[PDB]
Amino acid sequence: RAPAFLSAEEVQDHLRSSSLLIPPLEAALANFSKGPDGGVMQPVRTVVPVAKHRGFLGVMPAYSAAEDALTTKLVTFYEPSHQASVLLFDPSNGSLLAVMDGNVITAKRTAAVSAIATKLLKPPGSDVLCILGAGVQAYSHYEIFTEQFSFKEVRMWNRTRENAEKFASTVQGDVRVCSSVQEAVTGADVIITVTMATEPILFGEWVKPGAHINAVGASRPDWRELDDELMRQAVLYVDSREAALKESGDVLLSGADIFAELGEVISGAKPAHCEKTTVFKSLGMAVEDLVAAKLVYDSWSSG
Amino acid sequence: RAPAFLSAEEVQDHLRSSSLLIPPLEAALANFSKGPDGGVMQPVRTVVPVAKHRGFLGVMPAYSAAEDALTTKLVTFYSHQASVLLFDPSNGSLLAVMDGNVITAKRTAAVSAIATKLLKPPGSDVLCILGAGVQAYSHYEIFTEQFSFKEVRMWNRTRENAEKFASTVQGDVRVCSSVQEAVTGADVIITVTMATEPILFGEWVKPGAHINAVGASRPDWRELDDELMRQAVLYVDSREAALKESGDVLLSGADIFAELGEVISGAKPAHCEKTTVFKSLGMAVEDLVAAKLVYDSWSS
Ligand SMILES: [K+]
Ligand SMILES: [K+]
């Protein structure tokens, strides 16, 4: 029997509520971090180079025993530039139940993991939010952050100012567009770096002590968003230690020590040092995509 | 933006002729065995167990440069259910989601035929099929098309299914009561059984015979005995895959002489006078070739 096909529009209609998405993501992160005691099977991503066209195909299968869900995300990146599809299988008989868009899931799931980390890691008296970058991830983060948290001031810097200005006028609340990374981050309590810089743009010397940084961009071993002082002096949280030590250049080039996985903090195995300067380095994980995709399918197929 | 969805019957409708499928498989096999200069990107398959339901998900992506095609095969083993995704290689765009079962059956049968044209002994008159499932039909269809046998024989663990086969099929098929009766005097043997312990013993095999060993796809299962695996000249589609997945190879300790692609390219000889086994595991680039044929035919 043919699978259902769920377009980007159909996916977004079944993922309007972050409050429905955050809890299973917290469960998934915690379970992943339990490893062999947690029921998640998430093998290393396989990437197949298509050199003749300057492209990559990535494949990210995952199974969650706890939710009883089997998925595979297939993503292509080409120098939209990122295109993703999520496959959802019936875990009891292997049948292919759905092929759905993966871009929306990725935007929403990444923003949601960042919010979870920020809930746990932001300092006392978190009044200022700063966003570095102005693309898809800046929008999805802005959406969930301004609804989950109460910020007095939201600031933005982008490599090209015109795009930050467009962002600012499009979006509902007030956002202060800044001339530099420096101006944007000075006095900021929470920082979101959703950028395509390959060399450090955020320097530890500008960071307010106790600030929390969700570092989302620079998902290659040679690419960095953050300097050595910031990566070495902050308490460093990640989603996956294995993935970070293979894929994150901020981690690898700085030589920084990983304190914990976010899932270890959710489960109580590791403390949330929200008083100290913190970096959450997000790479993304197949089980996060699994969680959102399951949530989309169960919603679509019933209500 | 939405991909095309091709059902099993649509795939079958666009894969009617094996003489269009065989030449690009030959090129793919040779290009895979040439290494990096052959342009084939084929990572080791990723397996995800779902122990709660005693099942597994398998994922096999591939890119071919010669063909300029990009696919991923997703198969659940629990009874194999396969899906093939085909992408626009210049784009990343998902062009099609198609059934993988028909492709699997057609591709495997075509690769056995290629092996058989290269490795069957001189004066090959007798064909023998062990097993009577999906793979037996697809093998029979292409083999009677590609070769002219004086006699075709079959055995299956349940005789009822062997006679049902012999009735459905166009041409005379000798149903045989034992494996031994079926293979003695056989020039070409196809093993596509559900056996997990050796059912074919070297003792019964005519010197020079060619065996296509398609069954026993797990490292703890076998169809053939030690004598056959060690005395035969052993060919495979992929050496890496056989040393990981093939119980007949591992439990015997047999040495692999050549990849089938090396024979096609001229890098290794076809020792067709000697008793030969071709151990077929299946490769992502083999499915990619079939999927590309299908999609281009459908698209036209
Ligand atoms: K903090
Ligand atoms: K032979």
Map B254-299 to HEC letters: CCCCEEHHHHHHCCCCCCCCCCEEEECCCCHHHHHHHHHHHHHHHH
Closest by CA position to B265, among listed B8, B3, B74, B26: B26
- Backbone φ and ψ for B187, nearest 5 degrees, come out as -90, -35
Residue A103 is assigned to a ligand binding site: no
Query: Which helix (H) or strand (E) is A41 found in, with range?
Result: strand A40-41
Measured CA to CA in angstroms, residue A266 lies from A33, A117, A286 at distances of 9, 9, 18
User: How far apart are alpha carbons B9 and B102 in whole angstroms?
Assistant: 8
Closest by CA position to B229, among listed B245, B195, B260, B205: B205
* Residues in chain B, total: 300
- How many CA atoms does the CB half-sphere of B179 hold within 13 Å? 19
Are B256 and B236 a contacting pair, CB within 8 Å?
yes
User: How far apart are alpha carbons B278 and B234 in whole angstroms?
Assistant: 6
User: How far apart are alpha carbons B176 and B80 in whole angstroms?
Assistant: 28
Task: Please state the residue numbers annotated as binding site of B.
Answer: 45, 79-80, 107, 132, 134-135, 156-158, 161, 193-194, 214, 245, 280
For residue A120, the ligand closest to its alpha carbon is 1
Structure token pair of residue B191: 């093993």
CATH of A123-284, one of 3.30.70.260, 3.30.365.10, 3.40.50.720, 3.30.230.10: 3.40.50.720
- The 3-state secondary structure of chain B reads CCCEEECHHHHHHCCCCHHHHHHHHHHHHHHHHCCHHHCEECCCCEEEEEHHHCEEEEEEEEEECCCCEEEEEEEEECCEEEEEEEECCCCCCEEEEEECHHHHHHHHHHHHHHHHHHHCCCCCCEEEEECCCHHHHHHHHHHHHHCCCCEEEEECCCHHHHHHHHHHCCCCEEECCCHHHHHCCCCEEEECCCCCCCCECHHHCCCCCEEEECCCCCCCCCCECHHHHHHCEEEECCHHHHHHHCHHHHCCCCCCCEEHHHHHHCCCCCCCCCCEEEECCCCHHHHHHHHHHHHHHHHC
Going from the Cα of A230 to the center of ligand 1, the distance in angstroms, rounded, reads 12
Distance from CA of A62 to the nearest CA of B (A): 7
For residue B211, the ligand closest to its alpha carbon is 2
Write the CATH number of the domain with boundaries B1-120+283-300.
3.30.1780.10
Residue position matching structure tokens 């699978």: A3
User: How far apart are alpha carbons A105 and A91 in whole angstroms?
Assistant: 20
User: How far apart are alpha carbons B51 and B62 in whole angstroms?
Assistant: 27
Going from the Cα of B188 to the center of ligand 2, the distance in angstroms, rounded, reads 8
For the domain B121-282, what is the CATH superfamily, name and number? NAD(P)-binding Rossmann-like Domain (3.40.50.720)
Closest by CA position to B282, among listed B110, B131, B87: B110
The alpha carbon dihedral of A244, A242, A145, A150 has a sign of: negative
Identify all chain A residues contacting B76, using CB atoms and an 8 Å cutoff. Answer: 89, 93-95
Q: Which of B5, B76, B99 to mutate to test binding with chain A, by most A CBs within 10 Å of its CB?
A: B76
Q: Which of A7, A70, A74 sits opposite B50 (nearest CB)?
A: A70
- The type of residue at A230 is L
Closest by CA position to B249, among listed B275, B282, B213: B213
Q: Which of B53, B62, B83 sits opposite A91 (nearest CB)?
A: B53
User: What does the domain layout of chain B look like in residue ranges?
Assistant: 1-120+283-300, 121-282
Residue position matching structure tokens 């040439």: B34
Query: Which helix (H) or strand (E) is A73 found in, with range?
Result: strand A69-78
Are A250 and A225 a contacting pair, CB within 8 Å?
yes
Do the Cβ atoms of B59 and A72 come within 8 Å? yes
Residue A247 is assigned to a ligand binding site: yes
Structure token pair of residue B87: 């992408």
Q: Which alpha helices (H) appear in A180-259, and where do they start and end? A: 181-185, 228-233, 241-247, 249-254
Burial of A229 (0-12, 13-18, 19+ CB in 10 A): middle
- The type of residue at A219 is S
- How many CA atoms does the CB half-sphere of B124 hold within 13 Å? 27
- The type of residue at B156 is N
Are B64 and B40 a contacting pair, CB within 8 Å?
yes
Strand B80-87 and strand B69-77: the pairing is: antiparallel
B44: closest chain A residue by CA? A46
User: How far apart are alpha carbons B37 and B45 in whole angstroms?
Assistant: 21
User: How far apart are alpha carbons A172 and A182 in whole angstroms?
Assistant: 25
Are B25 and B107 a contacting pair, CB within 8 Å?
yes
Same fold, B1-120+283-300 and B121-282: no
Q: The domain at A1-122+285-303 falls in which architecture? A: 2-Layer Sandwich (3.30)
Q: Count residue pairs from A and B with Cβ separation < 8 A.
A: 116
Identify all chain B residues contacting A86, using CB atoms and an 8 Å cutoff. Answer: none
Method: X-ray
Closest by CA position to B213, among listed B246, B185, B181, B184: B246
What's the longest Cα–Cα distance across chain B? 58
Do the Cβ atoms of A61 and B65 come within 8 Å? no
Are B275 and B251 a contacting pair, CB within 8 Å?
no
* CA A39, chain centre distance (Å): 22
Do the Cβ atoms of B65 and A87 come within 8 Å? no
Closest by CA position to B155, among listed B125, B188, B178: B178
For residue A278, the ligand closest to its alpha carbon is 1
Structure token pair of residue B12: 């079958």
Do the Cβ atoms of A72 and B57 come within 8 Å? yes
DSSP state of A226: B
- Backbone φ and ψ for A227, nearest 5 degrees, come out as -80, 175
**Residues whose CB is less than 8 angstroms from the CB of residue B147 and which lie 6 or more positions away in sequence, other chains included:** B113, B116, B117, B120, B124, B127, B188
Q: Which of B79, B84, B87, B283 to mutate to test binding with chain A, by most A CBs within 10 Å of its CB?
A: B87
Distance from CA of A1 to the nearest CA of B (A): 8
User: How far apart are alpha carbons A142 and B34 in whole angstroms?
Assistant: 51
Structure token pair of residue B245: 């997945």
User: How far apart are alpha carbons B224 and B208 in whole angstroms?
Assistant: 16
Give the SS3 label for residue A146: helix
**Residues whose CB is less than 8 angstroms from the CB of residue A104 and which lie 6 or more positions away in sequence, other chains included:** A8, A11, A12, A15
Task: Please state the residue numbers annotated as binding site of B for NADPH.
Answer: 79-80, 107, 132, 134-135, 156-158, 161, 193-194, 214, 280
Are A27 and A66 a contacting pair, CB within 8 Å?
yes
